[PDB]
Design an enzyme around this catalytic site. Structure first.
Site, PDB file in Angstrom:
ATOM      1  N   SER A  42      36.765 -65.384 -46.470  1.00  0.00           N
ATOM      2  CA  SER A  42      36.032 -64.971 -47.651  1.00  0.00           C
ATOM      3  C   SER A  42      37.079 -64.880 -49.185  1.00  0.00           C
ATOM      4  O   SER A  42      36.433 -64.947 -49.851  1.00  0.00           O
ATOM      5  CB  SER A  42      35.102 -63.926 -47.799  1.00  0.00           C
ATOM      6  N   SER A 100      30.625 -60.611 -51.840  1.00  0.00           N
ATOM      7  CA  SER A 100      31.054 -61.741 -50.819  1.00  0.00           C
ATOM      8  C   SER A 100      30.050 -62.591 -50.152  1.00  0.00           C
ATOM      9  O   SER A 100      30.149 -63.217 -49.048  1.00  0.00           O
ATOM     10  CB  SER A 100      31.696 -61.268 -49.631  1.00  0.00           C
ATOM     11  N   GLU A 140      30.529 -72.277 -45.814  1.00  0.00           N
ATOM     12  CA  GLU A 140      30.049 -71.052 -44.974  1.00  0.00           C
ATOM     13  C   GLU A 140      29.084 -71.513 -43.916  1.00  0.00           C
ATOM     14  O   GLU A 140      28.131 -72.381 -44.439  1.00  0.00           O
ATOM     15  CB  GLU A 140      29.560 -69.973 -46.001  1.00  0.00           C
ATOM     16  N   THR A 209      37.937 -59.337 -50.322  1.00  0.00           N
ATOM     17  CA  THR A 209      38.071 -59.351 -49.058  1.00  0.00           C
ATOM     18  C   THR A 209      37.890 -60.489 -48.337  1.00  0.00           C
ATOM     19  O   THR A 209      37.583 -61.631 -48.810  1.00  0.00           O
ATOM     20  CB  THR A 209      37.537 -58.171 -48.409  1.00  0.00           C
ATOM     21  N   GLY A 210      38.443 -60.436 -47.098  1.00  0.00           N
ATOM     22  CA  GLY A 210      37.974 -61.745 -46.008  1.00  0.00           C
ATOM     23  C   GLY A 210      37.747 -61.565 -44.743  1.00  0.00           C
ATOM     24  O   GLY A 210      38.577 -60.297 -44.215  1.00  0.00           O
ATOM     25  N   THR A 211      36.995 -61.892 -43.924  1.00  0.00           N
ATOM     26  CA  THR A 211      36.591 -61.573 -42.579  1.00  0.00           C
ATOM     27  C   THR A 211      36.086 -62.686 -41.816  1.00  0.00           C
ATOM     28  O   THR A 211      35.344 -63.525 -42.351  1.00  0.00           O
ATOM     29  CB  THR A 211      35.632 -60.375 -42.471  1.00  0.00           C
TER      30      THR A 211
END
Ligand SMILES: CO/N=C(\C(=O)N[C@@H]1C(=O)N2C(C(=O)O)=C(CSc3nc(=O)c(=O)[nH]n3C)CS[C@H]12)c1csc(N)n1
Length: 265
Positions: A42, A100, A140, A209-211
């Site tokens: 993300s 996000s 996504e 953030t990113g996950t």
């Protein structure tokens, strides 16, 4: 020295850590696996908003976009509450950065148009900033699922940190548009336990953030010391040893942040 603590944190959490802090006039560059490729996840949503702003005047923010429930593919806390009303591009910017929101990121990519639903135009945007390494290929939620070693939807802590430096500290955007991007990142709601949790409370932190799967957890930030000196920090991690179902570790990104703070002070 410092690389022994990063390599120590790697051992403690069973992970691969990537760290980059671009050097300032008084401090040298911090690099740990800085040029190894990590997965965007993300984190691309923040420079994606910059592509939409750079291409259109501020009046474009008020254009309304409508969609259906079939378009909701991923975590979208805001987009799921507006399927009947629709959302304007400006609200999609807000949702994509501070929450996000995955659907808002996909719609913004379609606003960029072109092949792949907008991924080739987004890659083209990074090239205009000097980044010849990063690449986005899917939307996504597929872009979080590429196997390790697969170079699609990847970046490096080196490349991503310099991209963020130009959008926040540089002149990649005019001042009025640059103000909109920083405000959203300043009121982000998803990074409370990552880079923010590693720096002392009187340091200002804005982040995105990113996950993803394979234990992937990223955080990119611009931080301000109490005296007011800015720094850009990129921290990326994955845990491919545990396979697709690897659990991400937010504590790893907090510890690494604290290590960076003790050097910048
Ligand atoms: C910086 O984030 N910290 C948060 C936090 O996540 N807060 C959120 C945030 O930015 N919020 C916002 C908004 O988007 O403006 C809001 C707006 S919510 C909302 N407004 C509308 O106009 C509407 O039509 N629908 N809804 C749902 C309040 S909470 C939340 C937090 C939660 S507990 C705590 N101590 N902090």
């Amino acid at each position: 020295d410092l690389a022994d603590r990063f390599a120590e944190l790697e051992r403690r959490y069973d992970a691969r850590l990537g760290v980059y802090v671009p050097a300032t006039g008084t401090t040298a560059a911090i690099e740990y696996r800085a040029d190894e490729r990590f997965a965007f996840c993300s984190t691309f949503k923040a420079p994606l908003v910059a592509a939409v702003l750079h291409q259109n005047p501020l009046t474009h923010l008020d254009k309304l976009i409508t969609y259906t429930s079939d378009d909701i593919r991923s975590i979208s806390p805001v987009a799921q509450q507006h399927v009947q009303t629709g959302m304007t591009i400006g609200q999609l910017c807000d949702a994509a950065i501070r929450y996000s929101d995955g659907t808002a990121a996909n719609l913004l990519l379609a606003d960029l148009g072109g092949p792949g639903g907008g991924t080739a135009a987004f890659t083209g945007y990074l090239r205009s900033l000097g980044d010849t390494v990063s690449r986005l290929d899917a939307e996504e939620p597929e872009l979080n699922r590429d196997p390790p070693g697969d170079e699609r939807d990847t970046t490096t802590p080196h490349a991503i940190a310099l991209v963020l430096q130009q959008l926040v500290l540089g002149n990649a955007l005019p001042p009025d548009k640059r103000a909109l991007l920083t405000d959203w990142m300043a009121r982000n709601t998803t990074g409370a336990k990552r880079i923010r949790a590693g720096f002392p409370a009187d340091w200002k932190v804005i982040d995105k953030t990113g996950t993803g799967d394979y234990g992937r957890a990223n955080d990119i930030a611009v931080v301000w010391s109490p005296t007011g000196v800015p720094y850009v920090v990129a921290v990326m991690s994955d845990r491919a040893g545990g396979g697709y179902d690897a659990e991400p570790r937010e504590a790893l990104l907090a510890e690494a942040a604290t290590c960076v703070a003790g050097v910048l002070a």
